[model samples]
Target chain A: LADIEQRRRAEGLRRELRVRPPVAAELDLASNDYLGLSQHPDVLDGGVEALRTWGGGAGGSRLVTGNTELHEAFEHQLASFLGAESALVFSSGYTANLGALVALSGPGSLIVSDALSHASLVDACRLSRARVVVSPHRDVDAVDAALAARTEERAVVVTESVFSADGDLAPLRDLHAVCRRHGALLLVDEAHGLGVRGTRGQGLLHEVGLAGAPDIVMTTTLSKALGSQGGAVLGPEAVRAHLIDTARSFIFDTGLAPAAVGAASAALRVLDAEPQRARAVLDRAAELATIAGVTEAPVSAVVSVILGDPEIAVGAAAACLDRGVRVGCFRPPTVPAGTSRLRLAARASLTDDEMALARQVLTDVLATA
Target chain B: ELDLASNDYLGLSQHPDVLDGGVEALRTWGGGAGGSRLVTGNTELHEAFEHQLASFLGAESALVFSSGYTANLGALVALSGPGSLIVSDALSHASLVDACRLSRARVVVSPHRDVDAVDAALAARTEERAVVVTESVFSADGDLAPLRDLHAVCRRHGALLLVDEAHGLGVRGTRGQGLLHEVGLAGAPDIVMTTTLSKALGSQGGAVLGPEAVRAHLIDTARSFIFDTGLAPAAVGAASAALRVLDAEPQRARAVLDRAAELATIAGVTEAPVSAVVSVILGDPEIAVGAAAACLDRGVRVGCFRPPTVPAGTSRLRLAARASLTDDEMALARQVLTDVLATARA
Candidate 1:
């Protein structure tokens, strides 16, 4: 404990979370509400309905006394929507990634991945006991080089379609082609691509015309664009069937809150009716990118403005807030050293005026810093 | 203050339809899938739901899990191991990060969303196999990622991509299939997707959607899936009902989007309203706390987010929007928030 405190003090980094009652205001530019549906009446109603119907908690995991009709129906809905041979649900996106990655690869296997992947992937690699290799981000040549060098019984490759902090897109087609040539399995994390980059908001691969390709597997979250909670993996028929029997995360973790499942379902149906919501958000993303004048690749609905230094980044964020604007800040650890940034997301519901204001705030703040 | 600081985005927890579905399942099926999916757990309801979801989401198959976090843990542990390397984003959730630590794989922290960094890391290492992991949408900043680009990089290197769509399903794709479907990468990347039933679905439980072989492997080897308790009968029933509701009512998504946009505009935040989450950056932890308290005093519920859960020293408030709030309610929320901010500043 003393060591930890000392380290914290030395680094000027101490961490704690405060619980804020509802209604606090500071221009919420720090949350993950991409679609702004977290507090919708219907969403709340869905939660209440599930609670009144199913009781408070799941009471048990999915393997024992917990399997309910609600759970089954939600799974079916998810599978159908994603174009996967099968689908399974989890309580949180974090656990879902952990379950799939750890369960699929094990001792004596080789797992290759892009260095800019999520922490969940890192943890999964550690948990699975497989030999690991790190590749340069978005470099097919590096990946091929890594694959050529692997000396293991089995091999798997993983990455995300979009990078969260930088708001940049991954090269899915090139990656899949390389993996195919090397006879390696490829996994794509669509955490930042859903509801922001595809036809009907399917995801980055769909947008790039790579949906339904054989030898490809995908994972995603339900809370961002879906305006709900949870995560899932979309892959071939056989793999999904296998997970039902062996995936530990599914068996050990408690079911998601009934309300979450219900809300997700409701949200999906709504998406079907209004696909334009996704498009609008994409347009908003473009606008933000243009206005910020930042060197960022186009993302479905997210953009980033890199700040040269952590202190400057923090100061920029503070300046924005002081000017009645809130924004997301990415600093060391979260980003590579010297690449701290301000992350921006576009919502389908954002008005042109709001978008303009946000851009103005960002520009002004950065200039001041 | 009202209870707004929750993951209950759709509020289906108390809906009569959800309740009825549970009751009816309990009355008819006896309150359980019975055993593991390999055993008596396979119920007609379960099978039907799986079938429906598979077809609707365009996936070949689907498997249920107890929760989203566990599903990810189980997948990573089962698919990759000690000899493997997992390339991950530095800002991923704690659960995924912890899972990697437990698995004993070589952990490499890459710059968030820097494909060049990922490529460089891969080029440097020569592991047997590599797995890349990320969230469809980040929970903290509410940002979208470049899934297609990442998938391409993974494929080039012969790596696999594992995505956690906890925040994207039911809100990201056509009919809310999620980020994979949205990007048209569904069934294309050697991918595994995990999701929860608690937020948008407004129910309980989780699932994994992927290849049949992978699914089979999990069934046979995944400890978390096999040894844990099953999801309650009521939860399944309610979730099923909600799924049907999603197919039936298509306007709810729009409502949520509208509300989220309004909130973003009122707050003057740089992050746009993506899905149901809205964040307001407050550089100082103390200021964030004060703002939250001021809101509470005005009878508005909100969420305050700080370190550990997020990166250290990055403090802010996270507001989760829902489909149930009316225009008037949203307006009131905006006004109350303005008042709270003024008070906090004072």
Candidate 2:
């Protein structure tokens, strides 16, 4: 362990926890609270009310008595909001991806996954017991070729709507076409695409007019844009039923707490009532990208500025922090080697002055590093 | 009859202070932990809870996870690799089994609670790194593991002993520290403990308690911890409060075992329970389901363990005794179970 720590330190990969204040005292661009609903009055109230009503936790697994009225209500509302036949919630997005992929594809099946999918998807693919084929990032032709030449009868094409590290969007329509041609199911992780894409933040699938397509399954996190905890898989009723009966993560783990369900439900209502917030996030991301001098406009709330070296990225992030601007520094393992970057998440509530400050600080820090 | 299906032995889930703590946290820290702990989610509240849990459990450090299942997954996968050997109990939890499968290690399953098997397997292993995994109290059978003997064997073989205290915490030890504490192995250098906050803490989450080096190693390598979102603030606050409640009222732990003993007598089980779980073997899944249904119909909610959760021909009614069970509830449960068993015999 000491040797590993020493090696990490030499490589500038040693990580430590930096505690944050109760509320943001800095210009926040590091968190996944893209919608700025984490502190919203209604969301907080919903959580408190749930704690009062359903107590602190779901007492057991959902298979037992952990399935509360709040969980059912949230699932139903989420399914409706996303234009899916049904939805099932999990303890987190990682488990949601793990459960969905592992349960949907198994022995005698082939899983074609994007090379740059989230870490959760990578782990899920490894655990799925399926013949996994990794295609180049966002390459629909590669996916199609893999599915076309697969020996298995069942195939699932997996990708992220908005890639986590690069902030690039997958060609959903093209991928869906390939899946349709190959008779494979398309599973999209909308973790980054949910609050910043589509009309009123319905997600990238809705943006492309394939929201409720029969062969498409979607998994997303409530923690990101909804300002709550937990994850959900939205798809056809049959798929939802299959996961409930067979997904090991779902069957064995405790259900999402009632407070999280309430908060997410309330956040959904807020999203419905104030659709402009979704557009605001996109506008913020574009502005941040322009300031950072990135030619490619961001498709969602993430704007990546690649720095190539871990030390430079860490120094730049620290410089930003010193100037009261918090940003994320993605290093090795989190991102591919030699592609370490500064990941800035654009929130819906950033002010003009704050954005200007971030732009100036980031520009100065990047130039020096 | 009483409801005994849940693992809430301390009944702190609905305690007023615990509920208030959660509500206050929801109001203060917001509903979600904005991101993963490494990024933006490591708030002061989470750190405080980790420290409190470590202190209470007599560990040098603690790391919390979104679920007990994930905790096991993270610990096992990060601790062992392809060159290592993991000697696991045959009756270990499903999560541990899955972890072993994912660890890319040489996994050998020993018979249930067989320390000798574990010793021989570890001693004969080719890999220098070996891990022995067991649950302090078997989930289905309510039987206790021989922890001291297992620890001795592991020590002799230069192996690590990883104990899942999921069912042992809040039902063992003088202050509900866990079975390890009761056996004077609370903070043993080679012993790592994993437990669920959803069980005795009456909240949702899990924790890995051990040396600071272990915590640091998992933090750096555990994919589950790195990829999954942090446990919600509401859960953290509630679990912290529940720990305080447990510390204030140490008798709650003994009350649970006392109730379990009473339940064992009522169910006509000859062997005494080593924990709060009291099981009555009914032989067949159909019969166990029938008995559980009969009890439920008469206002008692007990767990019915069938195949996969338990072995075939050992299906049973798994009744978990809570510290809050009233005298009237106990009498009603005894009468109801007595009648049901008599009818089955006839």
DockQ, per-model, please?
0.06, 0.66
Docking category for candidate 1? incorrect
Per residue, candidate 1 scores C-alpha lDDT tens digits across B1-346 of 4544555555555556767776555444432332234323445666566566656666766666666666676687776777887888766644486557665688787777788787777777778578888888776666776788888888888777888887777667756677788899787538877777766666666777776656656665565565443354455776787777766665665556666777777777655676767887765777888888777777776777776456556687777777777667677788987677655545
DockQ score for candidate 2 = 0.66
The digit string of per-residue lDDT tens for model 2 on B1-346 reads 4678878899898899899888877887998887888777877888899899999889988999988888998988888878999999988746587788778999999988888999999889999888899999877677889999999999999898899999888888999989899989988888889988987888888899998878878877788898888788998999999999998999999899999999999988887788998888888888889988888899888888898787798888888999988999999998888888776545
Interface RMS for model 1: 17.2
Which CAPRI quality tier does the interface of model 2 achieve?
Answer: medium
Candidate 1 wrong stretches, greater than 4 Å: A13-26, A63-65, A295-297, B1-346
Candidate 1, residue B23: Cα displacement in angstroms equals: 18
Interface RMSD in angstroms for candidate 2: 2.1
Every model: iRMSD = 17.2, 2.1
